[PDB]
Each structure stands twice: as C-alpha cells, then as structure tokens.
Amino acid sequence: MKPKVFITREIPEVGIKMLEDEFEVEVWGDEKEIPREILLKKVKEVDALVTMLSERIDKEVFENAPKLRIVANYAVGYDNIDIEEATKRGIYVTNTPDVLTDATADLAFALLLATARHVVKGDRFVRSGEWKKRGVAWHPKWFLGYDVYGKTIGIIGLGRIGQAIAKRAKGFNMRILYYSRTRKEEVERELNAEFKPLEDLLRESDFVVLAVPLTRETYHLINEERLKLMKKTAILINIARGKVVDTNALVKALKEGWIAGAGLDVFEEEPYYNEELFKLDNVVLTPHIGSASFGAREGMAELVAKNLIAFKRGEIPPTLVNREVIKIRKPGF
Amino acid sequence: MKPKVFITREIPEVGIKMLEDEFEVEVWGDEKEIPREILLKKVKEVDALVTMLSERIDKEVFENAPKLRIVANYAVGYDNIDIEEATKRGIYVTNTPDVLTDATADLAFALLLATARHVVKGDRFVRSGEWKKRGVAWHPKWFLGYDVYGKTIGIIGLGRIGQAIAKRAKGFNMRILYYSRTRKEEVERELNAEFKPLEDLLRESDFVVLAVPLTRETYHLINEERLKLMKKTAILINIARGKVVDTNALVKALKEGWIAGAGLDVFEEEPYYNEELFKLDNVVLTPHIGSASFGAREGMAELVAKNLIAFKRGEIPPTLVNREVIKIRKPGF
Ligand SMILES: NC(=O)c1ccc[n+]([C@@H]2O[C@H](COP(=O)([O-])OP(=O)(O)OC[C@H]3O[C@@H](n4cnc5c(N)ncnc54)[C@H](OP(=O)(O)O)[C@@H]3O)[C@@H](O)[C@H]2O)c1
Ligand SMILES: NC(=O)c1ccc[n+]([C@@H]2O[C@H](COP(=O)([O-])OP(=O)(O)OC[C@H]3O[C@@H](n4cnc5c(N)ncnc54)[C@H](OP(=O)(O)O)[C@@H]3O)[C@@H](O)[C@H]2O)c1
Numbered sequence: 001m002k003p004k005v006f007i008t009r010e011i012p013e014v015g016i017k018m019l020e021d022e023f024e025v026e027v028w029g030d031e032k033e034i035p036r037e038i039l040l041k042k043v044k045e046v047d048a049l050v051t052m053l054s055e056r057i058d059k060e061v062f063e064n065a066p067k068l069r070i071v072a073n074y075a076v077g078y079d080n081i082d083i084e085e086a087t088k089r090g091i092y093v094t095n096t097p098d099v100l101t102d103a104t105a106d107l108a109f110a111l112l113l114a115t116a117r118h119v120v121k122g123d124r125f126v127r128s129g130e131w132k133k134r135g136v137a138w139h140p141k142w143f144l145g146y147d148v149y150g151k152t153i154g155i156i157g158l159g160r161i162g163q164a165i166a167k168r169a170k171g172f173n174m175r176i177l178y179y180s181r182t183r184k185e186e187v188e189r190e191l192n193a194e195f196k197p198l199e200d201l202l203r204e205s206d207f208v209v210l211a212v213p214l215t216r217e218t219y220h221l222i223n224e225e226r227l228k229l230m231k232k233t234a235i236l237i238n239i240a241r242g243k244v245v246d247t248n249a250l251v252k253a254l255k256e257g258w259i260a261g262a263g264l265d266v267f268e269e270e271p272y273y274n275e276e277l278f279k280l281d282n283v284v285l286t287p288h289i290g291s292a293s294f295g296a297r298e299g300m301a302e303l304v305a306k307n308l309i310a311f312k313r314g315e316i317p318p319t320l321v322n323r324e325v326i327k328i329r330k331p332g333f
Numbered sequence: 334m335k336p337k338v339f340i341t342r343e344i345p346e347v348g349i350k351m352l353e354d355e356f357e358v359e360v361w362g363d364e365k366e367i368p369r370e371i372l373l374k375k376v377k378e379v380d381a382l383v384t385m386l387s388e389r390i391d392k393e394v395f396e397n398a399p400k401l402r403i404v405a406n407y408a409v410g411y412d413n414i415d416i417e418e419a420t421k422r423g424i425y426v427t428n429t430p431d432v433l434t435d436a437t438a439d440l441a442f443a444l445l446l447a448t449a450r451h452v453v454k455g456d457r458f459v460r461s462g463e464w465k466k467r468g469v470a471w472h473p474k475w476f477l478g479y480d481v482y483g484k485t486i487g488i489i490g491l492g493r494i495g496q497a498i499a500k501r502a503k504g505f506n507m508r509i510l511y512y513s514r515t516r517k518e519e520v521e522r523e524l525n526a527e528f529k530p531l532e533d534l535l536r537e538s539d540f541v542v543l544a545v546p547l548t549r550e551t552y553h554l555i556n557e558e559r560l561k562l563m564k565k566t567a568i569l570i571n572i573a574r575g576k577v578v579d580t581n582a583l584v585k586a587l588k589e590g591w592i593a594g595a596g597l598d599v600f601e602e603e604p605y606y607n608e609e610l611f612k613l614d615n616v617v618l619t620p621h622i623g624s625a626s627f628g629a630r631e632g633m634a635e636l637v638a639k640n641l642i643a644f645k646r647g648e649i650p651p652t653l654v655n656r657e658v659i660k661i662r663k664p665g666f
Binding site for chain 2: 009010011012031032033052053054074102103105106107109110111113114116117118119120122123125126127129131132134135136137138139140141142143144145146147148149150164167168169170171172173270271272273278284285286287288289292293294295296297301
C-alpha cells in the first residue's frame with residue numbers, strides 16, 4: 001500500500017477502512033476545517049487527496065503537492081476546486097454524485113414544508129412554553145400556512161437532485177415546472193416536468209427550488225429583479241449554493257412582502273450569521289445539512305474509496321469530473 | 334333569516350358571510366376558548382351551533398339549548414361532542430372532512446421530514462449564532478439524520494388523512510404498510526398499501542404515522558409495550574389526537590433510545606407544557622396546526638355553512654356525522 005492519501009476531515013469509517021489495504025491513510029482530526037498553513041505542509045508526499053466543500057483546492061495547493069495525481073472531493077458539487085488548473089497538471093478530480101441525491105431532495109422538501117407551514121416557529125412557540133402561557137388551545141386563524149398539494153413547483157436545475165425533488169413533488173400532485181440549460185425529453189416524460197424560461201417559472205410558481213451548481217452564470221441568479229417576478233405568496237428553497245442567491249436582495253424581499261418566505265440550507269459564507277435575516281419569522285435555516293443522512297454520507301465515503309482505488313489500478317475514476325484530463329495523462333501514480 | 338346560530342370562535346369570514354343572509358349570526362370574538370359559564374348562557378335561544386375541537390359539547394350543553402337542532406363542529410374529528418346524547422335529543426352533528434385532508438397530510442409529512450433530518454434543531458443552531466460561533470462550516474458527521482426515500486412507512490388509520498399521507502409517501506418511493514379496522518381493496522390497489530397487524534407494522538416500519546380518530550379503542554394505543562416493538566431507528570409521527578399516545582411511555586422510549594425521535598402535532602392536554610419532553614432534541618412539536626393552511630381553513634368554513642344551510646332547507650347535512658338521528662327527527666328547525 002505505497003500510495004499516500006490525506007483526508008481533510010473524518011469521513012465515515014467505511015471509506016477509511018476501504019482505503020486501508022490499498023493506501024497509506026492519514027486523516028485530519030479536528031472538527032473545524034484544517035488551517036491552510038498545515039494543509040500546504042501535509043500535501044507534500046501525497047498521491048491522492050480527499051477534500052471537503054469548505055476547502056479551497058486551488059493552484060497554490062497543487063503546487064505544494066508535486067506528487068498529487070488525484071483529488072477526490074467528498075461532495076457532488078466541486079466549485080471549491082480549480083478544476084481547470086488541475087486538468088492542466090494532469091490531476092484527476094472526482095466527486096460523489098447520486099449517492100447523496102435522495103438525502104438532499106429529502107432535505108429540500110423538508111425545508112419547503114417547514115417554511116410553508118411554519119414548523120420551526122410553531123415548535124419554538126410550544127417548546128418555549130409560550131403556547132401554554134397564552135391559554136389558547138386551538139384557533140381557526142393561528143399559524144395559517146400555504147398549501148403544497150396540487151400547487152406549482154418550479155425546479156431551477158433539473159439535474160440529479162432536481163429530478164429527485166420532482167419525483168417527490170409528484171407525490172404531492174404538484175404541477176412541475178423547471179428551468180435548466182437543456183431539455184432531456186426522456187426525463188420530461190418520466191416526471192411530467194414542463195420547461196419554462198426562467199421568467200415564466202418565477203411568475204407561475206408557488207415554490208421555487210434551487211438545485212444548480214455554483215458557476216459564473218448561476219452566481220446571484222436570484223437577484224432583486226428576479227425576486228420581484230415571484231408571487232407575493234411564493235416560497236424560495238435553496239439547497240444548491242449560497243451564492244446562487246443575493247442574500248441582500250432576499251432579505252429585502254422578505255421584509256417587503258415580495259415573497260412569502262424562504263427555506264435556506266446554504267449561504268454565501270459558512271458558517272454564517274446575519275442578524276437581519278435571522279430575526280425574520282418566515283425563514284427556516286439549516287447548516288448545510290443537505291446530504292446529512294447516515295446513508296448518504298456512508299455512500300459518499302464508499303464512492304470516494306472506489307474512485308481512488310480504481311485510479312490506483314490504472315482505471316478511469318468511476319465519477320471523474322474533468323474527463324479532459326484523460327488526455328494530459330493516464331490513470332495511475 | 335330567522336334561524337339563530339352562535340359560532341364559538343372567529344372562523345374565516347367566508348363562512349360567516351355565507352350564513353349571514355340565512356341566519357342571525359353571532360360569533361365569540363376572544364381568541365381563547367369561550368368560558369363554559371358564558372357559553373351555557375349564549376346557547377339558550379340558538380337553533381344552530383358551530384363549535385371548535387377545544388370545546389366539550391356534552392349533555393349539560395344540550396340541556397341549556399332547548400332549540401338547538403344542529404351542531405356543526407369546525408373540525409373533522411368529533412370526540413369533543415357527546416354524539417350519543419345528541420342523536421338522542423334529535424340534534425344533528427356535522428363535521429368538516431376532506432376539505433382539510435391535504436393540509437393535514439402535508440403537515441404530517443412536514444413533521445416526518447423535520448424530525449428525521451433535525452430541521453428544528455439545525456435552525457436553532459444557525460439562528461442562535463452558535464454555528465458561526467463554533468467556526469465549523471460543513472462536517473461529514475454533523476446533524477446526521479435518517480433517510481426517507483425508499484424506507485418503510487406504517488400508517489395507523491388508513492382513512493381520509495391516512496390515504497393522503499400514503500399518496501405522498503409514494504412520491505418518496507416508500508414501501509407502504511398500514512393498520513386499520515378494515516381493508517378496502519380498491520384503496521390498497523390505488524396506493525399499493527399492504528395491511529399488517531398492528532404488531533408487525535410496528536416492528537417493520539421506519540416511520541409510524543398516527544391518523545386515527547380518538548375513541549375508547551385508540552385511547553393510548555401507543556403505550557410502553559408497543560413502543561418497545563418499534564425499531565430504535567424508527568420515528569413516530571402523531572397528527573391524530575394527543576391521547577392516542579401515552580406521553581409518559583413516549584418520553585421514556587425517547588430518553589431510553591427505544592426509538593429515534595418523535596414529531597408531535599397533538600397532545601393529551603392543550604395547550605401543553607412538559608419540561609422533560611421539551612428538553613429533548615429528537616422531538617419536533619407544533620401547536621395542533623394540522624389543518625392550518627389558508628385553503629383548508631377556508632374550505633372548512635364554507636363546508637360548515639353548507640351544512641347549516643342544508644339543514645335549514647329541510648335537507649340532510651352533506652357531512653352529517655350521526656346519521657342515526659335521521660330517524661329521531663327530520664331535518665329542520
Ligand atoms: N445543500 C446540500 O447539502 C447539497 C448537497 C448536494 C449538492 N448540492 C448542490 O446541488 C448542486 C447540483 O447537484 P446535482 O447532483 O443535481 O448536479 P447536476 O445534476 O450536475 O446539476 C443539476 C442541474 O443544474 C443545471 N444547470 C447548471 N448550470 C445551469 C444554469 N446556468 N442555468 C440553468 N441550469 C443550470 C444542469 O443542467 P445541464 O447539466 O444540462 O447543463 C443540471 O440539469 C451541486 O453542484 C451542489 O452545489 C447541495
Ligand atoms: N392534527 C390536526 O390538525 C388534525 C387535523 C384533522 C384531523 N385530525 C385527526 O385525524 C383523525 C382522522 O381523520 P380522517 O379524516 O382521516 O378520519 P377517518 O378517515 O374517518 O379515519 C381514519 C381511519 O381511522 C381508522 N380507525 C378508526 N378506529 C380505529 C381503530 N380502533 N384501529 C385502527 N384503525 C382505526 C378508520 O377505520 P374504519 O373506516 O374501519 O373505521 C379509518 O381508516 C380525525 O378524527 C382527528 O382526530 C387531526
């Protein structure tokens with residue numbers, strides 16, 4: 001097991017064990033992200049690298065790692081890596097798609113429902129004792145929320161996660177609108193999803209769910225202008241990336257009644273704190289837990305081991321991101 | 334509009350307006366439940382009565398209401414009314430089924446996902462600034478929750494709400510088990526739901542959802558013995574009636590790890606406070622808001638008016654509960 005690999009955070013043990021007999025494994029042990037200073041130092045003799053979304057694996061990193069031929073991100077997204085600079089150095093970059101799809105769609109719907117029906121607020125009300133204090137049991141007009149069944153959901157990014165979200169929406173007999181770079185008719189057919197230019201999707205939707213990678217294009221896709229297109233009753237759900245939304249524009253819309261509420265799993269800076277946003281009652285927040293299900297994180301761990309182990313054996317990584325590097329160099333150490 | 338009617342709480346105005354031109358409408362205006370003292374006094378000259386879940390419409394009430402010939406409950410459940418004593422006195426009792434089905438199923442699934450994925454907890458963590466304070470952005474083992482998609486759900490009471498919940502479960506490709514008093518083949522066929530004696534449903538389900546009315550039989554159906562039957566990974570969802578569950582047994586199961594967590598919308602006493610339960614992080618609570626969607630509450634108001642207006646025109650109420658009273662006396666004032 002000559003191949004050296006450094007994992008920047010403690011992923012589920014199943015992945016670690018899978019790599020044991022094939023690699024010399026070292027793993028960062030503190031919960032907080034690893035300081036760059038230390039990282040630059042630990043990547044000197046490594047062949048493989050397993051990083052997290054929060055870590056920025058740019059050019060400076062690839063420089064201090066002369067022997068690094070593969071970087072397996074422990075996420076499906078990969079906007080934290082400079083994939084262009086890596087394809088140049090013949091460095092393979094993998095990710096973990098599909099294994100975390102259901103957990104992320106499951107969380108998107110939890111947010112949609114929690115926001116639409118005020119579960120967080122109602123919980124605080126009960127748990128704090130306030131409900132008991134008030135002496136009121138049940139009231140016709142208390143915590144009135146929005147209907148979900150039969151409503152129109154507009155998925156922005158009908159990819160692996162987007163499609164999973166649409167499959168669930170069918171269970172809520174929703175009318176499914178979606179905006180995406182292309183139209184895959186076999187997908188439109190199976191899900192009964194209808195393409196709509198972004199402006200139309202924003203105008204006709206009761207729930208708008210973001211599920212696109214973060215790129216130059218998607219950066220601030222949801223701005224103060226597009227926020228005005230949505231209905232005053234619509235709710236926005238973001239389980240994509242924090243920067244796909246203009247927080248300031250969003251905070252304005254919520255305070256100004258442009259839309260009804262928001263469920264946010266991601267933010268422009270993580271961790272995040274914003275007194276204004278957090279004062280709001282029509283907002284539900286979670287600390288980037290989209291893929292946090294026992295099953296998903298375990299599957300991610302196993303998929304990363306598969307990619308690194310296939311690369312060892314001179315094979316194209318099952319979930320290789322930049323296939324254009326197959327040319328610059330072939331699989332191996 | 335000779336007929337007099339007294340609504341015990343301010344239901345959506347659309348219902349009041351519908352009755353305004355056919356009845357002499359009076360409505361209790363405080364938000365807290367009307368004191369019995371005042372109530373007994375207000376029902377003296379009333380022909381119709383519109384009550385809430387919170388009010389106990391027993392014999393003592395039917396007495397002080399010599400003209401009262403119809404009590405429209407503003408709820409689908411009716412365990413708050415002494416239906417027996419009413420059918421005796423020739424008093425028609427109606428409820429509001431179907432109009433609130435979707436809102437309750439929607440809330441039931443919202444609790445399911447929020448408990449499974451720690452939504453409430455995650456929000457407190459983010460909102461309180463604690464997440465920012467700790468310095469960790471994203472961690473492989475943080476807030477790990479349970480998968481929903483593909484899992485097994487056991488619906489106890491496959492009625493109007495139960496079936497709605499099963500329709501949504503299909504959206505999560507769940508395997509649907511269900512315990513109920515009878516088996517309706519056409520329903521099993523449409524939902525792909527499989528009957529299972531209560532005991533098997535409890536051992537095989539990852540999510541147990543209660544949707545039965547409160548009765549002698551269902552009283553404390555979920556006790557310390559049946560809770561031991563559930564998986565240590567299972568989650569219990571109660572959107573039925575607080576007393577269908579033995580809170581004490583539940584609190585025990587939760588602290589002891591007999592089951593993973595609970596999502597509760599109803600309680601044995603409302604409003605409710607319980608320091609032990611509320612200290613728990615694997616419990617999600619909401620103040621009996623199951624039917625609190627704009628559409629549901631509005632449809633309930635309109636349905637109650639349709640019932641009262643049909644009874645006036647000498648017709649059998651569309652959603653008449655106690656049909657055995659059709660004999661004791663015909664429809665009218
Ligand atoms: N919150 C969490 O815990 C969590 C968990 C997992 C993933 N995520 C986020 O979810 C993202 C997507 O995940 P996925 O697996 O579903 O990836 P994916 O399938 O590759 O992407 C989904 C869709 O985004 C579309 N898209 C890309 N750029 C677009 C643009 N400019 N305009 C419109 N549509 C665009 C893609 O269309 P085409 O492919 O046809 O161009 C694709 O249909 C990840 O990249 C990550 O940022 C968050
Ligand atoms: N939390 C909220 O905000 C909220 C909102 C609305 C309603 N609710 C509660 O939900 C209850 C059910 O609503 P629904 O419209 O679905 O009523 P439903 O359709 O009349 O009843 C649902 C099911 O319960 C079954 N059942 C009754 N007794 C049982 C027993 N002893 N063992 C097993 N199954 C039994 C019934 O079977 P059978 O057909 O064989 O009798 C039926 O299949 C309401 O009565 C109310 O208590 C709560």
